[PDB]
Every structure is written in structure tokens, then in C-alpha cells.
Amino acid sequence: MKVQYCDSLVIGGGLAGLRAAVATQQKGLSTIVLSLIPVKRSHSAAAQGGMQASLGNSKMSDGDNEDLHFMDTVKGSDWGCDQKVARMFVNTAPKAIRELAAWGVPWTRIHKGDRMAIINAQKTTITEEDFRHGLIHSRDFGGTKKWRTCYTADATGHTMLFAVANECLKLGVSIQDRKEAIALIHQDGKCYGAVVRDLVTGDIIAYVAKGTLIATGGYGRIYKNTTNAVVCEGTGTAIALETGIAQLGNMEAVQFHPTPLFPSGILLTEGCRGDGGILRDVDGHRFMPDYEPEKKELASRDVVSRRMIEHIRKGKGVQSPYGQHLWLDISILGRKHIETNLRDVQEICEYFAGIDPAEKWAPVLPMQHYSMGGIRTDYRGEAKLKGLFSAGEAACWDMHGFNRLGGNSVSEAVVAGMIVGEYFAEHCANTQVDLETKTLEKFVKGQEAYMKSLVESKGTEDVFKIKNRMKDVMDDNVGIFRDGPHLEKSVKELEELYKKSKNVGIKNKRLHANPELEEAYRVPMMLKVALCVAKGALDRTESRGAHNREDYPKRDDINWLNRTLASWPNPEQTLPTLEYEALDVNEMEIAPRYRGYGAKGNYIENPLSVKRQEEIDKIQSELEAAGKDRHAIQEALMPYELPAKYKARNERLGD
Template sequence: MKIIYTDVLVIGGGLAGQRAAIGARRRGHEVIILSLVPAKRSHSAAAQGGMQASLANAIMGEGDNEDVHFADTIKGSDWGADQQVVRMFVDTAPKAVRELAAWGVPWNRVESGEHEVVINGKKVTIEEKDEAHGLITARNFGGTHKWRTCYVSDGTGHSMLYAVSNQAIAQQIPVHERMEAMSLIHDGDRCLGAIVRNLITGELVAYVAKATVIATGGFGRIYRVSTNAVINEGMGAAIALETGLATLGNMEAVQFHPTGIFPAGILVTEGARGDGGLLLDGELNRFMPQYEPDKKELASRDVVSRHMEYHIAQGHAAKSRYGEHLWLDIRLLGEKHIKRNLREVYEICGHFLGVDPVHELIAVRPAQHYSMGGVRTDHRGESSGLRGLFACGEAACWDMHGFNRLGGNSVAETVVAGMIVGENIADFCDDAANELNVSTSLVKQFWKQQVDAINMLTSGRGKESALQLGNRMKDIMTDKVGIFRDGEKLEEAVDELQNLLRRSRNIGVRVKHKTANPELVNAYR
């Protein structure tokens, strides 16, 4: 049995995990990051639209401040957010944007003078002040009273992830790639690390740490159609729950983004609507003003998604061989704007739909996008049930988003939570009362449990297919635990999922080797 010791073990190599690691490392603690994929390929890179921070540099953001951002976030959460956490977040977000700028994120900047923009479907002219020239600018996003979303065209997450990852490299923080945490080590009171499987060699390694951080992202891939990467299956939440000590929170709160391209579900950024794009129905009529006269296409995501699905149910959808959908129209933005500020949207539409959004409509329908639920923590980011276990980013639930998240608040939360939780982790490790005291026999006990579980899969004669069970689970979640829910369908879903759980105890694998084996990975997950 191989044991690796460190002060801080971060499970997840995206923005939240890396920023938390940087915070702990700056305080002098040894940190190791585990990642399923190379860190710069983490799902954080897929964030397109931007990061909310109340800088108020652009003319359309004048009058914005932390209080306005706070009010927007609380209202957008359907009044379900923890106000202490939201206050910390909105106060820290401007600092985070400026820190990222210093690290090399090429934020779009204010250009003084007159500019033509699209507001409410009409082209209007706004004039930026000379004194604001060169400052970080912002675009409009749903559910906000001011233009507050700082952005790098439509590659914001990519730029942020590369900058933060480069900073982690500069801090000499090792990233152990192609490694998956299988279970958490604990003594019934405190988390002491994790048992980790090397996805290439199949080796099981014990990582022992003073503090362990779960930053594994969301669980979108339990749905049939999701904007999430294929690695976002909720494994961080699963291993926390399996301790029997750490708890999960708000797991019913799942966000569906209005504009997943149909039928693939790949995200079209909210920036497309923030910049002036319109939603049209099958008759090419703009329909959102009849449901939301004030915010229209830029109501909060949960509201827009519900209205879209309702409009489809009323018989106003466009028809295709793949099913019913609606249209997103960004043609009025013009070729120059699309290819400059929405270039990723332009490329995605060409590659996955075969359409040119400069001249053609984009087929869209709501798709699962974000998990408000996750590992339950306090405002410090520490689990309320297992000391020494922390969580941040989409994998955590410290009630920042309540029951709905505003666009631009998630990518902001990754770095803000990383900043805050990283400092709290360092405080935890600095406390002499939290010195590491763990027996090798305890570590070996957890290691052997995972060895036995793998051996049972590779040597057993189970007949069930993990792939088939997983696909059925996705169908159940999509059809019965989606945007619209009722008691009858939820009860049916529970019964069917419990049946799948029973069947999963008889999973078998045809490929028996323990090295790089996707079938085995699916089976033990």
C-alpha cells in the first residue's frame, strides 16, 4: 500500500480547486491537487459568458455597487440564499476580477466614444466616457439591474482557468492527473484524506492530509441532456455522502439553461441574449415579452426555461426530426460582433449544428446546466458533519445561490470561494489542535475496502450493465425530475431509481483488466 502525505489534498483541478490550493500554498502549506483530466481541461474552461463583479466602469453599469449585486443575487435565488455568504461573495468579487487581471486574464475593456448595441431587440447608441477608457467593461446578463458581467469575449472560463493554472504552477503546486478519489478516509470525526485510483495504471493510493477539499464540480451528467462535461457526474458529493457523516444540501435545486443547442445540449452562452439575441417560437414570433414584460429574454434562467417549456407545450414549437425546439436569433447583432464577442458560439453552431448564426437561426431548448446542491458546508466552506473536510465551487452547497443561480455568478463563485475557503483551510492547518494523527491500520482499512470493491467487479459474474443502468437513470431524471415536477412523477422516479440501485449490486464487467478501463470506471461509479 502506497501512502502519500500532504497538508492539503484538493480533489478537483478546476477554478475553485486551484484557487483554494493557491491560497493554502501561499500560507506555507504543502498542497496536492488531484484531477481526472489535465487541469487546463477542467470543465471551468467551458464557461463562456462572464463573471459578475460590481465594478461600474461601463456606462450601462453606472450606479452599480455591492448592494445592488447583493439584492440581484438574493432575488435571483428565489429568496433561498444565505445572506451572509452572498455578502461575502459580492464584497470579494471585484477584488477577484482585479487579481485575475494581474495574473493575465485579458478582460474586455471599455472603449470611449459612441457604440451601437442591441437592447430589447433594437439597435441603440450608447456613449462611453473618456475617463473610463481602458477599464474592465461589462455586458448585460439575466436577472440583473446593471451591466455587471466582466468577460473575455465568450472565452471567459478558458482565460480564467489558464491564468489560475499558471499561477498554481508558479506556486509549484503539484497536480496529479488522471486520478480519481474513490472514498474519503476518516476516523468517525475528522476527514484524513482519500483513497485514490490511478485511471491509467489502476493502482490504488492513499493520500493522507490535514485538510481535504472537494472541488469536483456539478452532477449534470445524471441527466440525459446537459451542458456539463462528461466528467461531471457528482462523484465528489457521492464520496462525501458515503462517509455517513458529511451531508448534502439543496440537491433538489437543479438549474436548466435556456439555450442548450438542440439536440446536442451544448451551451450557447447567456451572453448571446445579453448582447441582444432574441428567442423566437416555431412561427418566428418573439414570445418572451408576453411572459416577462420587463426583463423579457433576460429574466433569470429558471424563469426563462420554464416559459420556454410551457410555450412548447402550448404548441408553439418548431419541429425537426429530433423533436420540438425553439429558436435563438442573434443575426441582428451583426457579423463583426458575433465573430469578435461570440466567436465560440459561431464555431459551436458551425461544428455541431451546421448553421451560420450570422445568417441563420440557432435551434435551442433548455438543458441541465448547474447544480445548486452539493456538499453541505458552513460559511467557512467546512463540512458541518466531518471536521477537516472542505468543499468549494459547484461541488459545495454553502447556500450562495439558493434555488436558482444568476448567470455569471458561478464562475465568479469559483474564484471567490477558492479565495475565501483557501484562507480558512490554511487557518485550520495552522491550528495546533488539528495536527495530523492517523494510524496506518486505519488507512489500510479504507484502502482494502476499495481493493475488494474493484476485485469484486473484475472477478464477479454480475450480469447488469453499468452503461445501461446509467442511461436509464438519465432518462428517469430527465423525464420525471426536470424543469416541471409533481408528486406523482417524483414518487415514480424514486421507485424506479431504487430498483436501479438494487440492480446495480449485480453489475459485471466484460473487460477484466484493472489498467485503463472505461467499463470498470463506469461500474464502480
């Protein structure tokens, strides 16, 4: 048998996984990072919008702080998040930005002077004073009143990922690519590592560690249309699910993006840098003002996606061989001034759409983009399976609830990498494990036998058409608008699809470097993940955040102010087991109310929300009278934990 040992095993080489590896390696814990691909090619590298952090450097960031960022996050989550985790996040984001700056990330900086446009109306000139010069700049992104999205020109995710990967190399972290975790080794409710398949040689290897962290990203690829990389298939989520003990949280909470290029899914950051992009229908008609007279195209991205679907169902969409879509027109600009970098989007359209933005319109359609759901953890990042941690998009640490704030996800990846990293390191240093060869051999030989059965299978099903059928079902029935009848049917077809995946047969019999063998074991996993999303969507009879039930259009704070927990106890069951974790209103710093976007008064009020709200109002007014600061008032409303390393305050311009 082949066995590799390390103190801390990290599964996933994205921003979250690499940052967590830095935390453990810097304290002498031997650490290995496993990844399907070279870590610098992870999906994190595609982030172009930016990272959210309340620095308060620029004019449009003036007066920003943890409280304001916290509020935007909670309301955005439509009260589905763990508010304490959100506090840990907003308080730590500023220091993540600054640590990366010290690591060389070339953040765009502020320079003295005036700027034009970049505003909805009224004002149009921005002035950056001399004392702001040279500090990290910010842009308007995510729809927050206060501009706090930091960026390194047009490749933020890329420069961030490279810096964290370079730090890993500096510290001597062991990075092993083209290696895939296909199962978790566990016994007596404890995780002792993972069974790994070497994608090149085909060897099945056991990686044992005192602690294991899963930072495998999202599961967007279960959908046909997604912005996600080809590797975001949710297998990390699946192996966690297949332990029969670790639980998945809010898998039905999927976020879409309104304007990806159709049908590729390639992101056109059009209308971001400089608002001007106009959405048009089949008649060239600018429809957004018809649905949103005030906000128009600048409405909440959440709203824009819905309106685009509504307009298409109204029969005003553009027909094409790949389905219906709409138009994105930016030609209305095609020119400006200079003094800084502002030229990219055209290339995307020319290289792929095969056209110049300044001339023709780009085809677009809302597509899957982010996975709020993931492996359920406590505030420390540990799952129900002891010794198993998770961070990043792969987790449901839950600072996102039912709607992630634009710019908060790449921020969570690094922030969670820092915080969960500390707790993960602590666990790995203090715990003591009993590694039984009997258990190791069982899991290892079990996967070798599994690989052999796949290669020897005389099944007649085709893995590729089963995977493609799954993606269609997810897109057609588990998209922006959902209803019981269709969810019912999708769940049924997915379950049927799952049973057929077990009768797959492949042509290439080799055990090494086999793309076909890879699909044979990954698809069944994706189907289990899909089932959790679909079934979770069917049973959740309410509309919350990105989850929209046309048959239950209102947010039900009485029966659904909770979190969906999915598990798969019996390896033979064909449907996930769903449970619910209720959210304690008393443990909230901000009681449920209007989320700030979408229709008004569209939620069933919970008597306790009113009760808690009054208490909050009272507790604040009093302490505020006694001349107590926001830090003391926050602590009185909802105390939260932070590891020693990060409990310091964040210095800001003009304290």
C-alpha cells in the first residue's frame, strides 16, 4: 500500500486552500496541498470585479467601516447567514487586503486629482485629496453605497492567487497537482485523511493527516450554463457528503450572473468599470426601464436577472441554435479619455464572440455563477466530521446566506483561509490521532476495486450523455425561477439519472491518464450534489435571496428562517436526507426586515423579529447615551470570536 503522511492536508489549491496552507506551514506543521490542476490555474484566477474590504481610503469610500460592510452583507444574505461569522469576516477583510499588499499584490492606487462620470446621476466629478494619494483604491462594485471593492486593474483574482501560491512555494508547502481526492478516510466520527487518485499514473494513494481541510470551490458545472471553470464540479462537496456524516448547507442557494456571454458563459465585465452597457431585446428595445423605471439597468443584479428572464418569457428574446438570449450593447460608449487603464472587454468579444463591442451587440443570458451552499461548518470552519475543515466557496461557513454580496466571495476565500487556517492549525497541533492500517487498507482497496469495476463494467450507458442530460435538467428546472411542479420532475429525473450512471461503460480500459475513467466516477458524484440542490429547492417552500419559488413568492421568516442541512447516511439511498437548523433571532445583531432590494413588504414577519428588534433599539439608545462607542455597542448586541492573531482593530485614514 502507498501512504503519504502530513500534519495538515489541504484539498484544493485555490485562494482558500493556499492561504490555509500558509497558516499551517508557517507554524512548522508539515502540509500538503492537493489539486486537480496547477494551483495558479484555479477558478480564483478569473476574478476581475475585485475584493470587498472596508478600507475607507478613497473619497467614495470615506467613512466606511466594519459596521457598514456588516450591514450590506447581512441584508444581502436576506437574513440567511450566521451573523457572527459575517462579523468575523468584515473585521478581518481589511487585514487580508493589507497582508496581500505586503506580499506584492499590485493593488491599483489612488492619485490626487479629479475624475468624471462613474455615477448614476447628479454628481459626476470626484476629488481625491492629497492625503489619500498612494493608498489602495476602490471601485463601485456589488451595489454597496460605500465603494469598497479593491482591485489590481483588470486581473484581481489572478494577482491574488499568484501571490498566495508564491508564498506557499517560499515556505516549502508541498504542492501536488494532477492529484484527485475521491474519498475521505474516517472512523468513529473522525476524519483521518483522503484516498487520492493520481490522475497521471492512476495510483490510488492514502494521504493521512491529523487534520483535513476541503477548499475545493463551487459546483457550478452541474448546470449547463455557468461562468465557472470546467473543474468546478463539486467533487469535494461530494466526498464530504459520501462520508454519511458531514453535512451540506443550503445547496439550493445558487447565485446567477445577469450578463455572461451567451452561450460560452465567458464573463463580460461590461457595464462595470464604467456604467453604460444597455440591455436590449429582440426588437433592439431597451427594456430595463419598463420594469425598473428608477434604477433601470443599474438595479440590483439580483433584480436584473429576474427581469431578463421575465422579458424572455414574454416572448421578446432572441432565438438562436443554443437557446434564447438577450443583447448587451456597450457601443453607446466605445471611447473616453485616459489617465489610467481601461481596455479589455473588447478582446473577450473579439476573441470569442468574434466581434468589436464598439460596433455590434453581445449576446447574453443569466447563468450560474456562485455557490453559497457547501460543506456545513461551525464558525471555526470544522464540519460535523471531526478533523474535517472547509473554507472558501466549497464551504457554507455561512456569511452569505441566500445571496452573496458582489466582491465578498474572493474576499471570503482569503479571509476564511486566514481564520479557518488558524483554527485548523490549532486542531492539527493539539489533536492526536489513531491511524489504523486496517481502516486505511479498507478505504484504499475499496477505491481500487471501484476503479476496477468501472473499467470492467459491461454497462451500456454513456457517461457523457448522462452528464449532459443532468446539466439540462438543472438549467431548465433549478434556475432563477422555480416552482414545485417542475422541481418535482427534475428531482425525479435526477434520481433516475443517478441510477443509470451506475450502468455506465467506457471504451478506454487503462487505469492511467484516462479522461473517460475520470468522468465515470465524477458524474455519479455530481448527480448526488445536484440532487441535494434540487430536492433542497423543492422542500424549501418560500422565496429567499437567490431562491425564487413562483408558488411561494414571499420570504417566510416564521417557518423558514433556517438552514437546509443535507446528508447521505445510507450509501444505498437515492435521495438526500434533509434536516433544518433554525436561526436564533436573539443571536442576531440585526433583526430580519427589508433586504434592500426587490419588492417591498414581501416577507412573512416573525413575531420574534419584532421582539428582538425593539430590544436592539433599546440596548443601543441606552449605551449610546452613556457615550459608549460602536465597538462596545456591537459587543453588547452580539459578541463573536476571533483567533488571537486577528482580534486587533483596523486602522483607517483619520482615526
